[PDB]
From a paper:
The main protease from SARS-CoV-2 (Mpro) is responsible for cleavage of the viral polyprotein. PLpro cleaves the viral polyprotein at three sites, while Mpro is responsible for cleaving the polyprotein at eleven distinct sites, including its own N- and C-termini. Mpro self-processing is called maturation, and it is crucial for enzyme dimerization and activity.
Here we report the cryo-electron microscopy (cryo-EM) structure of SARS-CoV-2 Mpro C145S mutant containing the nsp4-nsp5 cleavage portion, at 3.5 Å resolution. In this structure, we glimpse the in-solution state of Mpro, bound to two unfolded nsp5 protomers during N-terminal processing. The final model showed all 306 residues from C145S Mpro visible for both chains, plus clear evidence of an at least 11 residues long peptide occupying both active sites. However, the cryo-EM structure of Mpro C145S revealed a dimeric particle of Mpro anchored to the nsp4-nsp5 region in the moment that precedes cleavage, with detailed density of P and P‘ key residues. The electric potential map around the active site Ser145* indicates a non-covalent interaction of the nsp4/nps5 peptide (residues SAVLQ of nsp4 and residues 1-6 of nsp5 Mpro, SGFRKM), forming an extended β-sheet maintained mostly by hydrogen bonds at Thr24, Gly143, Ser145*, His163, Glu166 and Gln189. In the cryo-EM model, we can see Gln0 occupying the S1 subsite, with its NE2 side chain moiety interacting with OE1 atom of residue Glu166 through a hydrogen bond (2.7 Å and 2.5 Å for chains A and B, respectively). By carefully inspecting low pass filtered particles used for final reconstruction, we noticed an elongated satellite particle anchored around each one of the dimer active sites regions, with size and shape consistent with a partially folded monomer of Mpro. As expected, the analysis indicate that the highest conformational plasticity is concentrated in the active site region of Mpro, with the highest RMSD concentrated in the regions of helix 43-53, and in the β-hairpins 19-27, 62-65 and 166-171.
Numbering used by the authors:
A (entry chain B), B (entry chain A): 1 to 306
C (entry chain C), D (entry chain D): -4 to 6
């Protein structure tokens, strides 16, 4: 049994990151084969933090200005290039620990295990959910840029994130390994605020599925409501609307637990209307919403490895 | 900023575990140097579940009956022995990835990152807190025995747990690598129930420190109460009593945030008496209590690596 | 009763 | 204001 914030193993990602330094500005970089993917903040002094000119700054920097350290190993930068909003530093050494990697741009709501790092030493790993406003509620400090988020399935790693900045409201922002940001953010110290945060409904449904399977079934009731009424109530309660695709992806959980999707949709609607009533579901008094159905399946009674 | 359930990196522990099999009963084991520490559940058929005779069972099993698999690598069992409630299988191959390991028996309330595993493949890693009733609220299923919990400091790993059983109330139990249980349990399918669960006060205070430093300071107030009154209120609210040592270990956080210990003790007492009043502290509507002050220091503004 | 775990491996 | 991050290493 048991159910809590469980993150993927990190060794395959622990052994594939280095420290990238330019002058007095350093950060973490994701090392794959003979390439190092790093945020382009590396070529930025403190005085030009407001409106960096990344083209001019990159065309000013040289090959030897980039310093790559894999623990205590020194790496030479054979070449450097920029794509979108990241830098690929072609290095002379191929990483022996690089696993089967994919660069996927995950849609909002899909969770992933970020590897919080500082100066090339993995500080830790924890789950995060890509919010609909295209931010992550991670725990990062100065020097944590380049802390990649990833998924692991069938012993294959898919990197889907690279941390870049904190928003003033406390949430964090990042790119994919291709370079494009997640959202309308810009790579400069300009006043940027994410949109209104909306709680993900499908993740809540997966969390309720996990609660039912674990042994907590007080919220279940015989009452059943249609999809459209549930969508209206979620909209007036600031939750993401539920589509047919979300019900379709919940099919394995419905088969595993034996409760139909609409039944727990009605139960969830009633939970919103009457509140949580003061009691507790699996150690949380608020609806946890960073649990995808795939994560529930691979973490609950299913015995999926990685 | 940011603050959530952050667990230690696992690669140094991912690369040091194998699968131990006897007949039709398999499970996970911790491989260190030329030794494999496994639960003695491995020598257990389904029929003798009530009162296993581990001495007779071990004296009946032979060396070749134990099968050790490191992924796709087959390991020969040179010898086997029992200590307390674990088996050390001396194998012919020394693990090249074994790090500096220590076997520490953590006191209740000290958190640790369990590496949930299934059939030798690391399924994931997540934080857990050793409850005062000497249980952990982990997420484990069948075949997860041997999933070691560990801490990492100064790139040195200290194993402090090994999962063995689930209690009927839903919490899990385990040993240390020395073999002694954490609590009054017995290693058999006998009806065993843990005592009344008590929330750890020092961990709550550390969580409040993290909330204050992160930027949430609504609960703070000028009211201040003595230690004895706070202890009485915690006792009548089913929390662990607070001693002088707990205030002493909280010193670094007091210096970092500038808030006196008794001030937040009074604030916490008032929170207990008046409830949480429906608002939220860092995504949780209940007092999180699996955050040690050391974990807060190494996770918050402190830039400690591993 | 305890649900003390180990894997149920075939063969 | 954005808190665009990197390391604050000296030398």
């Amino acid at each position: 049994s048991g159910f809590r914030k469980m993150a993927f193993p990190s060794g395959k990602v622990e052994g594939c990151m280095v420290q990238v330094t330019c002058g007095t500005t350093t950060l973490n970089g994701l090392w794959l084969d003979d390439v190092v993917y790093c945020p382009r903040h590396v070529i930025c002094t403190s005085e030009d933090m407001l409106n960096p000119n990344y083209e001019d700054l990159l065309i000013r920097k040289s090959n030897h200005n980039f310093l790559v350290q894999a623990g205590n190993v020194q790496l030479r930068v054979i070449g450097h290039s920029m794509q979108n909003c990241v830098l690929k530093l072609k290095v002379d050494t191929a990483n022996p620990k690089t696993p089967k990697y994919k660069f996927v741009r995950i849609q909002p709501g899909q969770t992933f295990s970020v590897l919080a790092c500082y100066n090339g030493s993995p500080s830790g790993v924890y789950q995060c959910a890509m919010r609909p406003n295209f931010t992550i509620k991670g725990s990062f400090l100065n020097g944590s840029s380049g802390s990649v988020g990833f998924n692991i399935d069938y012993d294959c790693v898919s990197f889907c994130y690279m941390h870049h900045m904190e928003l003033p409201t406390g949430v964090h922002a990042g790119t994919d390994l291709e370079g494009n940001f997640y959202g309308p953010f810009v790579d400069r110290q300009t006043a940027q605020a994410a949109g209104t945060d909306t709680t993900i409904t499908v993740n809540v449904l997966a969390w309720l599925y996990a609660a039912v399977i674990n042994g907590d079934r007080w919220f279940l009731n015989r009452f059943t409501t249609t999809l459209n009424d549930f969508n209206l109530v979620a909209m007036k309660y600031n939750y993401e609307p539920l589509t047919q695709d979300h019900v379709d992806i919940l099919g394995p959980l419905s088969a595993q637990t034996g409760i139909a999707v609409l039944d727990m949709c009605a139960s969830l609607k009633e939970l919103l209307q009457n509140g949580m009533n003061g009691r507790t579901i699996l150690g949380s008094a608020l609806l946890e919403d960073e649990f995808t159905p795939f994560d529930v399946v691979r973490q609950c009674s299913g015995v999926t490895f990685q």
